[PDB]
């Protein structure tokens, strides 16, 4: 192992861990990542990793809920040989899910409306606690851009069309932040495109 396994959690059911090996490795054969919740009568689960580069691998740890006191032990094996021992606390490394279904509405001449979906169900903590960042830019000129912070707990944004150049096409994408503690940015949504006019 070169760099040490690090993990993040979506605070629902999936934790993603990443490491980089030594030489070339096929992870789906050869390697196993064993994880176990520190909890009365728990059993160790086993995660078969997928390759994400020459010597780089990823594992998706399946989980019941995520509560802040949850702690896991992590054991990377290579057959009979133990390569790495560690531990992971999901609530110390939150990376929320990417928003989705990003849509631009061009049906009102003066004002653009962007909408998109919160990737969580109403009963998760994050559902009520997600901030968003909307990134707009001209398709062939990334230096002509905007960033909008959406903190009002509703996946929508409005802009005056007059704030963007006309006759040109723009792209847009959005990512999510938990506020929380120990959170990082989600992945970007897929992006959308429209031709700006007014």
């Amino acid at each position, epitope marked *: 192992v070169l760099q040490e396994p690090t993990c993040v959690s979506d605070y629902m059911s999936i934790s993603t861990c990443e490491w980089k090996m030594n030489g070339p490795t096929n992870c789906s054969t050869e390697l196993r990542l064993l994880y176990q919740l520190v909890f009365l*009568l728990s059993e160790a689960h086993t995660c078969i990793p997928e390759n994400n580069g020459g010597a780089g691998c990823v594992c998706h740890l399946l989980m019941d809920d995520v509560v802040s006191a949850d702690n896991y032990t992590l054991d990377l094996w290579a057959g009979q040989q133990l390569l790495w021992k560690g531990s992971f606390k999901p609530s110390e490394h939150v990376k929320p899910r990417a928003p989705g279904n990003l849509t631009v509405h061009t049906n009102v001449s003066d004002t653009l409306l962007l909408t998109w979906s919160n990737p969580y169900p109403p009963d998760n903590y994050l559902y009520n606690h997600l901030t968003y960042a909307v990134n707009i830019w001209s398709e062939n000129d990334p230096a002509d851009f905007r960033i909008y912070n959406v903190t009002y707990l509703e996946p929508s944004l409005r802009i005056a069309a007059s704030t963007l150049k006309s006759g040109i096409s723009y792209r847009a994408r959005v990512r999510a932040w938990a506020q929380c503690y120990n959170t990082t940015w989600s992945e970007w949504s897929p992006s959308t495109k429209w031709h700006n006019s007014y």
Partner: nanobody
Framework: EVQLQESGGGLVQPGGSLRLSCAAS????????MAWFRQAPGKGLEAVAS????????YYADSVKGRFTISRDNSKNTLYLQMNSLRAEDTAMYYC????????????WGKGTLVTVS
């Protein structure tokens, strides 16, 4: 300062079944761990089954796998232990325990219910 009171014990024939209950004086859903332990005459305490109250995810000792089921009704603040295919070996005092800050289940204890099998 959670309080726990078990009920539902009694004498049984080998092969027969039983259902235990444990009312809690506060929300089961705010507990981290909830479990059943038991103590047979002459022997030490042993965990039998445990549960994650929010999700319902349940865990078991080998000796009760296939026979016992742990469950909870969060709306009644209650924990259950359905005991099937009882053997003489299962004769013991049975306890519900809980903990809030660790998954050891050692913070709070009930008074116990005897389960006799002969």
């Amino acid at each position: 300062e959670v309080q726990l009171q078990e009920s539902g014990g009694g004498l049984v024939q080998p092969g027969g079944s039983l259902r235990l209950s444990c009312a809690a004086s506060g929300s089961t859903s705010y507990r981290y761990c909830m479990a059943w332990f038991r103590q047979a005459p002459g022997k030490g305490l042993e965990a039998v089954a445990s549960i994650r109250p929010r999700s319902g995810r349940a865990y078991y000792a080998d000796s009760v796998k296939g026979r016992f089921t742990i469950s909870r009704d969060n709306s009644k603040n209650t924990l259950y232990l359905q005991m099937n295919s009882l053997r003489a070996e299962d004769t013991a005092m049975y306890y519900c325990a809980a903990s809030d800050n660790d998954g050891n289940c050692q913070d709070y204890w009930g008074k116990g219910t005897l389960v006799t099998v002969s």
